[PDB]
């Protein structure tokens, strides 16, 4: 169920091979399958040569916590996944970004977590990995190939990312106001003031449901309903050559607009498709990605389509009583 979306895991041979910018959605998803995006992130920010996700690709990334509802649906996008597709940004952790306790950081080369106001990734440079606490990168000869298995990657959180329906600032302000109401004893989350409490604890691990609705910070939630709507939009399909892999942006724009390519049931239903007498000797075939759909959060008497919906560990300070 949690296999690849489109591409079996990579077997890179050169850690110095360039990572190409691909325009095609099915191209980019294939990179996401091969954890080429995380490898890209690492090369960009962390003095990293090579790749993570060797052999195992995205389906084998480590998660915290390890029971992880959303990883079972390969087509559910983690923060790094959305970042590759331009939907959010996983920023490079700096000194003011708290590493949540809990995860097995040891030996990890990349981990990321949603934070109260964004998404933060920690990297390690070539031939280094993380200490058990994750505070430091230290030598690790076990990573000298620069082709690292997927378990050197840690995605913190049961997190799902999707195209949002933007909400007016006043709505977010109301959600924000409900969130404060539901968590009166949380003062700061991930350094960001959440409630006003002159008097607060050291930052504590904080596991919480939350949605990113595209404003200054996420809105954390206790009692809330979620609903998964299968929307069958063209982002929910992937177009490939069953062996030659994903199709060009032109090829995939054809299939999702002209209805002349091959496709599983849902794709022919919603975009049309031609079976038999393949006009092109090498035609493409689009299929639905394995995911429950788009999540609509009901919270504070409101319904939202958020950027991300997640349950994950953040750092919160507690009010002194």
């Amino acid at each position, epitope marked *: 169920d949690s296999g690849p979306i489109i591409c079996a895991g990579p077997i890179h041979s050169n850690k110095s091979a360039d990572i190409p910018h691909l325009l095609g959605y099915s191209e980019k998803i294939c990179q996401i399958d091969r954890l080429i995006h995380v490898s890209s992130w690492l090369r960009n920010h962390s*003095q990293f040569q090579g790749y993570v996700g060797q052999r195992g690709g995205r389906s084998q990334v480590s998660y915290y916590p390890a029971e992880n509802s959303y990883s079972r649906w390969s087509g559910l996008l983690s923060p790094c996944d959305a970042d590759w597709l331009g939907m959010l940004v996983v920023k490079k952790a*700096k*000194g003011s970004d708290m590493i949540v306790p809990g995860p097995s950081y040891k030996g990890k080369v990349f981990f990321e977590r949603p934070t109260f106001d964004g998404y933060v990734g920690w990297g390690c440079g070539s031939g280094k990995s993380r200490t058990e606490s994750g505070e*430091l990168c230290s030598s690790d000869s076990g990573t000298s190939s620069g082709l690292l298995p997927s378990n050197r990657v840690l995605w913190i959180g049961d997190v799902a990312c999707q195209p949002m329906t933007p909400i007016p600032e006043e709505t977010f302000l109301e959600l924000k106001s409900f969130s404060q109401s539901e968590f009166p004893d949380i003062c700061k989350i991930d350094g960001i003031v959440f409630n006003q409490c002159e008097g607060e604890s050291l930052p504590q691990p904080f596991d919480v449901a939350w949605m990113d609705v595209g404003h200054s910070h996420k809105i954390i939630m206790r009692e809330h309903k979620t609903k998964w709507v299968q929307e069958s939009s063209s982002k929910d399909f992937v177009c490939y050559k069953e062996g030659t892999g994903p199709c060009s942006e032109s090829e995939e724009k054809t299939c999702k607009t002209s209805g002349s390519c091959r496709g599983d049931m849902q794709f022919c239903k919603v975009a049309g498709c031609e079976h038999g007498e393949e006009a092109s000797e090498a035609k493409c075939r689009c299929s639905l990605v394995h995911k429950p759909g788009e999540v609509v959060v009901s919270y504070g008497g409101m319904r939202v389509r958020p950027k991300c919906y997640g349950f994950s560990r953040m750092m919160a300070t507690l009010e002194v009583n």
Partner: antibody
Amino acid sequence: EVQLQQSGAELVKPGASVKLSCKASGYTFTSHYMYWVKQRPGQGPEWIGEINPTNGGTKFNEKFKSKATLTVDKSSSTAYIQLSSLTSEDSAVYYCSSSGYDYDGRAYFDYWGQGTTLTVSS
Amino acid sequence: DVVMTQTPKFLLVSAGDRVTITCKASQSVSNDVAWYQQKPGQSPKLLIYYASYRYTGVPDRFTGSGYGTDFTFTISAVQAEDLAVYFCQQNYNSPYTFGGGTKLEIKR
């Protein structure tokens, strides 16, 4: 495209205050912290503070917490520094800069104002 | 707060010589140190970011290396143009702090 345009040379009597301005252009003003760095003649730079143009939130070099007030006008892509209680030791070049990772372009960027010169003297 | 101890304060070298500037952070700053070249009358010009990446449009000769607390900036072959003050900057944790620079001067 990208330009941090700083306000012109300034000469103020001691004890006066002065508002230096930096107009950002060519990039999304609110996506990048603005930093102010002071540099005295022939000295190295002093990092003054950072302002978050989304927030007006600021982190200061403690040596400047009372010397400078940092504000940002989103509406005109302008970061301002208000240097008060000026003595001759405030005479210097003041730079605004934004640097960091541009997550939109996916490249590091490092942009500096032309510098604004302050002479504290009567 | 985080002190960046940049050595040497002065270099005298001949065009063609290798120059290595070292910066020791008083505490770990990841790879978040930038190397600026500053020529007189000019603002600082970023050469190296993220400890070891040339900023775009930077000649091959300028390189940087380091992680944690030990950062090295190198001009593999100094050219006369490279008269400037060089300084690391930690941008890991605020307040961002500068190395005391290095006046590079050309023996001639």
